[PDB]
Design an enzyme around this catalytic site. Structure first.
Site, PDB file in Angstrom:
ATOM      1  N   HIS A  91      49.515  72.430 -29.251  1.00 14.39           N
ATOM      2  CA  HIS A  91      50.716  72.921 -29.932  1.00 14.39           C
ATOM      3  C   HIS A  91      51.384  71.839 -30.756  1.00 14.39           C
ATOM      4  O   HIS A  91      51.535  70.691 -30.298  1.00 14.39           O
ATOM      5  CB  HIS A  91      51.737  73.442 -28.919  1.00 14.39           C
ATOM      6  CG  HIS A  91      52.144  72.441 -27.879  1.00 14.39           C
ATOM      7  ND1 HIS A  91      53.244  71.622 -28.026  1.00 14.39           N
ATOM      8  CD2 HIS A  91      51.625  72.158 -26.658  1.00 14.39           C
ATOM      9  CE1 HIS A  91      53.372  70.865 -26.947  1.00 14.39           C
ATOM     10  NE2 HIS A  91      52.400  71.166 -26.106  1.00 14.39           N
ATOM     11  N   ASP A  92      51.753  72.229 -31.977  1.00 11.28           N
ATOM     12  CA  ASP A  92      52.602  71.419 -32.866  1.00 11.28           C
ATOM     13  C   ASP A  92      51.916  70.217 -33.496  1.00 11.28           C
ATOM     14  O   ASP A  92      52.581  69.421 -34.164  1.00 11.28           O
ATOM     15  CB  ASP A  92      53.931  71.010 -32.206  1.00 11.28           C
ATOM     16  CG  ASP A  92      54.659  72.188 -31.592  1.00 11.28           C
ATOM     17  OD1 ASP A  92      55.013  73.097 -32.356  1.00 11.28           O
ATOM     18  OD2 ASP A  92      54.893  72.196 -30.351  1.00 11.28           O
ATOM     19  N   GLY A 111      50.274  67.296 -27.608  1.00 11.82           N
ATOM     20  CA  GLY A 111      51.285  67.999 -28.395  1.00 11.82           C
ATOM     21  C   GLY A 111      51.954  67.142 -29.450  1.00 11.82           C
ATOM     22  O   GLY A 111      52.185  65.963 -29.229  1.00 11.82           O
TER      23      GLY A 111
END
Lengths: 258, 264, 269
Positions: free
Chosen positions: A120-121, A138
């Site tokens: 994620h991200d 992340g």
């Protein structure tokens, strides 16, 4: 018969007319797939994913699935993938979180080898290579023309700048400035990526200036500010490429490898 | 008269006739459910999940695509015996995980408890016993007969040697190789891993008392920093710390139950 | 026939949902599970069993009595950026165990257009065998082992979990690679190598005894090891002292000589 009859495609999906989708693929809601892309058999696109043109995604890849962050609460978040990427078997590319910008993004001309994880991200640029079993945690930001050696793991929030090279089996805890070869567990700096420079046919004057800047940053007992000032005065005027190294130091939030 | 009163099990899933699946369980396209599988209420399987056989799955679990759950183990001694995998409640089992059934040479049982997170490509070998509220990060390999307690964290790309006992509230660093037992509360890290103190930061954030934390720090010092034998450390913990800090019992348990010796 | 309390919920060797290229050559008793994909120019030998969800990409020969588990990608095009769609192959022998999420890739024309794996190997979950590897027999690759391009592995090798082997390395017979290692150089026969990056830690004594090897044989291999690694000797001089003092009574010492002579990356030290 470009889309195998056994592929299950959410009615919301938008798929360009020459896209190939192999048997037993699953395409979830809010997915878009651009022209010339090919999915092999057994690909899962979870949802909320934009895939560009001329990508190739191999069997058992999990693309655009919800993140592993335990703070996640079902919010709408996205994955974006650009053009001409190769995503190999058993990769896992996860969507963003609202805590950041609700987006995971990968650019173009990337190779993600077997079992590459993009958390994620992450923001990943162009022309990167992630070797087998590479884990990117992340919020990691990766530039262009980076090579990440097999079985390496990158700590959340690290910034991995363009033309850097991460050695096999590294644990990266800090930022890796542009052009830098970083290796080991935990990873430290080992010089400028010279072979990569000369493989792109870079000049003697460029490489030498970058070697000098490396010395000022990593080996001269100078603070970040002092190193930047000496690069600016002594190297940058004739080696504009040195700017990427100044950027790395100025943008570093975790500190840099040593 | 004959209405359902409730789509949930995709028509492409291949389910063995012996399987018992609770009425609200969701099973995605192209899943394979083998013989003698039970799946509890509220559980969700995504597409492409294989449950090999002889597996009991509890309530409110979520299992993601390409997980291999309850497959026969990799022990070359295994000879097709009908051994089991048991999974509890409220677990998250991410893509590409592999959880293998037990061997008769031990107790015919691999067991995981409840509220665990198994991140992408977590491997749980035959005969592992895992407790509750644990976190396994990506690419973690847990070898045969490993016993893990509660509230443990295992960092990414780490591996744990067969038969090790990883006790409650311990933490295993990323890119580590664990060869011996990790006592309760202990931070272990490296290849091969060494002990780096108590997880003070966790305890403070979790609101454990300053007295408890200080007691566990002192117990750690007796075990690791005082030149004491295992038994001398235990006896001193019993006399001087245990009376005000009953939490120190978990550390006594670690040393007393250790079969491989402890990581130091 | 029960007309009252029957369940009424239902097998073929090859599941109806397997999709098989018409060019495939499959022995009579081969089992293929649901949703498998068998590509062009694949041959599968007698006694072999594929579970559900196996992909065999193409141009692959598989021998007898293999067992391939779900989510294995077998004989897919390699990951070398030099590869440009040329006809290249994967060969697998007999009695191999290929576990979940393994990935075995075909060769490149830059080498000999062939990846080859022998017989009686155990490839645990997520074993990666890159383009152009040659692997012999009776090897064990533990979980998450990544073997890069052009690696040559002999027989009776054990590779510990979460390890990586750098392209072009030669890993010789009876060697043992510790868990979480990165191999950057050649590993001689019988040698224990461990670490990131790996270094040498003596002869695989336990492995020998486990195959029934004599104490005379073992002691000889240890003397040869001492000559190669611990006697301040050159590669050439070590070979000579082995040839004159060990190889007579311990013919098994030849493997170690082979390792030194055939080494192209240098040996792990």
């Amino acid at each position: 018969d470009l889309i195998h009859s056994t592929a299950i495609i959410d009615p919301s999906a938008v798929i360009a007319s020459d896209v190939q989708i192999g048997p037993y693929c699953i395409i979830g809601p809010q997915v878009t797939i651009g022209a010339g892309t090919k999915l092999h058999s057994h690909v899962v696109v979870g949802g909320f994913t934009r895939i560009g043109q001329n990508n190739e995604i191999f069997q058992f890849a999990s693309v655009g699935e919800v993140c592993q962050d335990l703070k996640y609460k079902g919010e709408e978040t996205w994955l974006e993938i650009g053009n001409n990427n190769l995503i190999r078997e058993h990769c896992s590319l996860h969507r963003g979180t609202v805590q950041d910008n609700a987006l995971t993004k990968i650019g173009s001309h990337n190779l993600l080898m077997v079992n590459t994880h993009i958390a994620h991200d992450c923001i990943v640029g162009d022309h990167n290579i992630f070797a087998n079993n590479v884990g990117v945690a992340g919020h990691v930001h990766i530039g262009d023309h980076v090579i990440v050696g097999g079985n390496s793991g990158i700590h959340q929030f690290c910034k991995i700048d363009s033309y850097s090279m991460i050695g096999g089996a590294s644990l990266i805890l800090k930022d890796v400035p542009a052009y830098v070869m970083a290796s080991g567990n935990p990873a430290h700096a080992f010089g400028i990526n010279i072979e990569g420079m000369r493989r792109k046919g870079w000049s003697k004057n460029t490489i030498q200036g970058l070697r000098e800047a490396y010395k000022l940053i990593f080996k001269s007992g100078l603070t970040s500010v002092q190193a930047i000032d000496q690069i600016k005065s002594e190297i940058l005027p004739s080696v504009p490429e040195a700017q990427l190294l100044i950027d790395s130091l100025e943008q570093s939030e975790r500190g840099i490898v040593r």
